[PDB]
Amino acid sequence: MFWLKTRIIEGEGSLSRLSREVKGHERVLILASGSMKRHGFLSEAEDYVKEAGAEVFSIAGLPAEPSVEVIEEFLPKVREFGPDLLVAMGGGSVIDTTKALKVFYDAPELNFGEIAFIDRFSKPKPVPRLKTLLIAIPSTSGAGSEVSGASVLKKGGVKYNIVTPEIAPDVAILDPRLPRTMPPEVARNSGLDVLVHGIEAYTTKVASPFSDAMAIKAIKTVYRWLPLSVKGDEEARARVHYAATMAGIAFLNARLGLCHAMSHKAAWIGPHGLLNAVFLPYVMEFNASKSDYARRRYAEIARELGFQTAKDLIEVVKELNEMLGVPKLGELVDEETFASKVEEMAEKTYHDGLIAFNPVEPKPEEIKELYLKAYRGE
Amino acid sequence: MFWLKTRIIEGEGSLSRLSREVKGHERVLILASGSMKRHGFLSEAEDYVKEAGAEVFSIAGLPAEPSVEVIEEFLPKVREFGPDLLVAMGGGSVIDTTKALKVFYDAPELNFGEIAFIDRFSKPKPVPRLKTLLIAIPSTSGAGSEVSGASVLKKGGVKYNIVTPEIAPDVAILDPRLPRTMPPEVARNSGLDVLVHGIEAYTTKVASPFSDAMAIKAIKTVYRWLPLSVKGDEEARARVHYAATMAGIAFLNARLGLCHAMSHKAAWIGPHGLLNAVFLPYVMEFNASKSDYARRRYAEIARELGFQTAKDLIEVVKELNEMLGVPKLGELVDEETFASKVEEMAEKTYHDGLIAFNPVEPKPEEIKELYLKAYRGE
Ligand SMILES: NC(=O)c1ccc[n+]([C@@H]2O[C@H](COP(=O)([O-])OP(=O)(O)OC[C@H]3O[C@@H](n4cnc5c(N)ncnc54)[C@H](OP(=O)(O)O)[C@@H]3O)[C@@H](O)[C@H]2O)c1
Ligand SMILES: Nc1ncnc2c1ncn2[C@@H]1O[C@H](COP(=O)(O)OP(=O)(O)O)[C@@H](O)[C@H]1OP(=O)(O)O
Ligand SMILES: [Fe+3]
């Protein structure tokens, strides 16, 4: 099974094509991150929507970590303005917020509780056909969220998933100018997100040749270019920006695995892509020892980078962490804070629906010793 | 830009899926190649359709390399029956005929010459929104028509296109069981079409990273696996089947170039896949000699296969043609018939829309020269 609902416009200055894509439309709403205001990209985009003869209304400065509580502040304003096209311009959380917004805006009657996964034993009601077009313009590189029909919200501090094709964007615009404004830390952290997505997508149970083609290329590109991107090279920024969407196309179809689940639960420690990379080598080790499939697949990636064995890949990834100056896990959290929460973290990683796609099904106890190997810096 | 309308369903016995996809509809028309009847797959298809509770009607023995007059006789039939779902089961010829039929079924006020790409320069009448669902099921590996928006009909021993996303199939089902009954020359010819698609789609002016990913995976897979497939290795057949569609996705988006334009105008000579294989090494040499871009992109492909230079790849291709018994051009057509037509072929190739996407635009004189190079078996 391989599909892609989203239509992808890439290119230097491709933001200008927002002119073509809004034709026909009356009242366009842009949700935007702070930085997209500051660096003037929000202005540019506002021009294009006027250019095309439509009303535009902007909310900038949306906070990280999407939540219902946050969305509920705007929602009244959004209803007042009544847009017939949504545009998200920002990172993952701007785009994911905008997806959740479409649901509430197009289907006001729906109950949030009816229609959100929390764990693997959650069945929700499916989401009915929605109507309002969604254009996604990512400014990091990147979350993949601009091609995916998934969105992750908090209500009352609890993490929820919403999963439907209806909220996968109709168009994504990939303009390398935008992520050239990333500071090096955010370049690094989101860039490792891509690599980790790539590798998990390649080693789930539902991988296809088609999703494999996008994963492999994304991996090859991030390995080659990310160190240069982090240091600010213009070309490199553009190459990793496209690789981020490639990996998005891949895990849209193939889903993800144990590293992601573990990094979801460890999210209070620090940033999502940072922890992902920190756990990756340990998760790879676990998967390869227990699974003849994982070992084969890691080995295939290794060869695509001009090495040989699954051991080579794990070492390649440890080395790339060291190169880019990724912290040890115990430079972020003290040992008692950690060992307290570590019982409850391995519990709820077990109840995550993503481990159905992992090439091994771990028990809660094995998961715990993984969190602890990684703290050991083994 | 990158997009994919077609939902792809792949895997062993995935033909059994027809039944879920037709759920909802009442009158199914299957158009099939003769071989699909002979090998029992047509009966299998009909059962699945009946099982979903719809009336089925089959027409089998659609001709290879269809002409425009194929429409005129079959179209009466469709109207007679009046389907709300079309299924094409066969090679590219059959899928293209089904495609063409949808146009004249759903939009009865059109005619081939209005809407068909004849001249580069005289643009044609656009095709309006059509309505009838179309499911493609390729049995060769392959023309890639199961994901493309094109249909190729002969008028007067020359190939022209209809192009619109309205005739890109809604679903493609990829069951390796079907292509496993290809006789080895069909498997050779359609298999080398994949290789040529990949290389051309990698080298157009409009190649994106996204199409490249599909194109490169396609090229690698075919190079490794096609020799085994031609002998009849069951696994190899599966692998080249999925690759055929990868190449399709690539050239849906990146288009094709001079080799295909040349093949289309020389269609009166032989099978599409064969002619392409014959011209390709000459098209590559020509492009390398005129274009730094072509030279560098060929080297990239070369290195993915474990060689160095554009010249390595040209020789790889020559040596695979020989390994697979691909005949010389001088064996397929006599000298004086060729010499009497090569001016006309070159001129019509030059007015073909595809040569705008070629890295270099060649003169009518240069196209003629390339045809002759090919003939001399240089
Ligand atoms: N639209 C596009 O994007 C695109 C691109 C390139 C080429 N094309 C077009 O597609 C055509 C090329 O088609 P193709 O290479 O797929 O082959 P094809 O021309 O559709 O069929 C070739 C032959 O293969 C036989 N056959 C097919 N499947 C078989 C099976 N499973 N077992 C045994 N025999 C089998 C058929 O015999 P029977 O007839 O007896 O069954 C037929 O005579 C050309 O006309 C070309 O113009 C389209
Ligand atoms: N192009 C850019 N330049 C500078 N900072 C950027 C940026 N894109 C995103 N960021 C910042 O990087 C952070 C990461 O955003 P995010 O949480 O959406 O990342 P991700 O895409 O990984 O989900 C944001 O807090 C954002 O700050 P503002 O919202 O204040 O702009
Ligand atoms: Fe072809």
Coordinates of N, CA and C in Angstrom, one line a residue, chain A residues 142-145 190-204 215 218-219 243-244 247-248 250-251 254-257 259-260 272-273 276 280:
Chain A
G142 N 13.5 18.4 9.7 CA 12.1 18.6 9.6 C 11.2 17.5 10.1
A143 N 10.0 17.7 10.3 CA 9.1 16.8 11.1 C 8.4 15.8 10.2
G144 N 8.3 16.1 8.9 CA 7.5 15.3 8.0 C 6.0 15.6 8.0
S145 N 5.6 16.5 8.8 CA 4.2 16.7 9.1 C 3.4 17.3 8.0
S190 N 16.4 18.8 14.2 CA 15.4 18.4 13.2 C 16.0 17.5 12.1
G191 N 17.3 17.8 11.8 CA 18.0 17.0 10.8 C 18.2 15.5 11.2
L192 N 18.4 15.3 12.5 CA 18.5 14.0 13.1 C 17.1 13.3 13.2
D193 N 16.1 14.1 13.4 CA 14.7 13.6 13.3 C 14.5 12.9 11.9
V194 N 15.0 13.5 10.9 CA 14.9 12.9 9.5 C 15.5 11.5 9.4
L195 N 16.8 11.5 9.9 CA 17.6 10.2 9.8 C 16.9 9.1 10.6
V196 N 16.4 9.5 11.8 CA 15.7 8.5 12.6 C 14.4 8.0 12.0
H197 N 13.6 8.9 11.5 CA 12.4 8.6 10.7 C 12.8 7.6 9.6
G198 N 13.8 8.0 8.8 CA 14.3 7.3 7.7 C 14.5 5.8 8.1
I199 N 15.2 5.6 9.2 CA 15.8 4.3 9.5 C 14.7 3.4 10.1
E200 N 13.8 4.0 10.8 CA 12.6 3.2 11.4 C 11.7 2.9 10.3
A201 N 11.4 3.8 9.4 CA 10.5 3.6 8.2 C 11.1 2.4 7.4
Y202 N 12.4 2.3 7.4 CA 13.0 1.2 6.6 C 12.9 -0.2 7.2
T203 N 12.7 -0.2 8.6 CA 12.7 -1.4 9.3 C 11.5 -1.6 10.2
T204 N 10.3 -1.2 9.6 CA 9.0 -1.7 10.1 C 8.6 -2.9 9.4
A215 N 12.9 6.4 1.9 CA 13.7 6.3 3.1 C 15.2 6.3 2.8
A218 N 16.5 9.7 1.6 CA 16.5 10.6 2.7 C 17.7 10.4 3.6
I219 N 18.0 9.1 4.0 CA 19.1 8.7 4.8 C 20.4 9.1 4.2
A243 N 15.0 16.2 1.8 CA 15.1 14.9 2.4 C 14.2 14.7 3.6
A244 N 13.8 15.8 4.2 CA 12.9 15.7 5.4 C 11.5 15.3 4.9
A247 N 11.5 11.5 3.8 CA 11.3 10.7 5.0 C 9.8 10.7 5.5
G248 N 9.2 11.9 5.4 CA 7.8 12.1 5.7 C 6.9 11.2 4.8
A250 N 7.9 8.5 3.4 CA 8.2 7.1 3.8 C 7.4 6.7 5.0
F251 N 7.4 7.4 6.1 CA 6.8 6.9 7.3 C 5.3 7.2 7.4
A254 N 4.9 3.6 5.9 CA 5.6 2.5 6.6 C 5.4 2.6 8.1
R255 N 5.0 3.7 8.6 CA 4.9 4.0 10.0 C 6.3 4.0 10.7
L256 N 6.3 4.0 12.0 CA 7.6 4.1 12.8 C 7.6 3.0 13.9
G257 N 8.5 3.1 14.8 CA 8.9 2.0 15.6 C 9.3 2.4 17.1
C259 N 12.0 3.5 18.8 CA 12.7 4.7 19.1 C 11.8 5.9 19.3
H260 N 10.9 6.0 18.3 CA 9.9 7.1 18.4 C 9.1 7.0 19.7
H272 N 12.5 16.5 20.9 CA 12.1 15.2 20.4 C 13.2 14.6 19.5
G273 N 13.7 15.3 18.6 CA 14.7 14.8 17.7 C 16.1 14.6 18.3
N276 N 15.5 11.2 20.2 CA 15.5 10.2 19.2 C 16.9 9.7 18.8
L280 N 18.8 6.1 19.5 CA 18.7 5.3 18.3 C 19.7 4.1 18.3

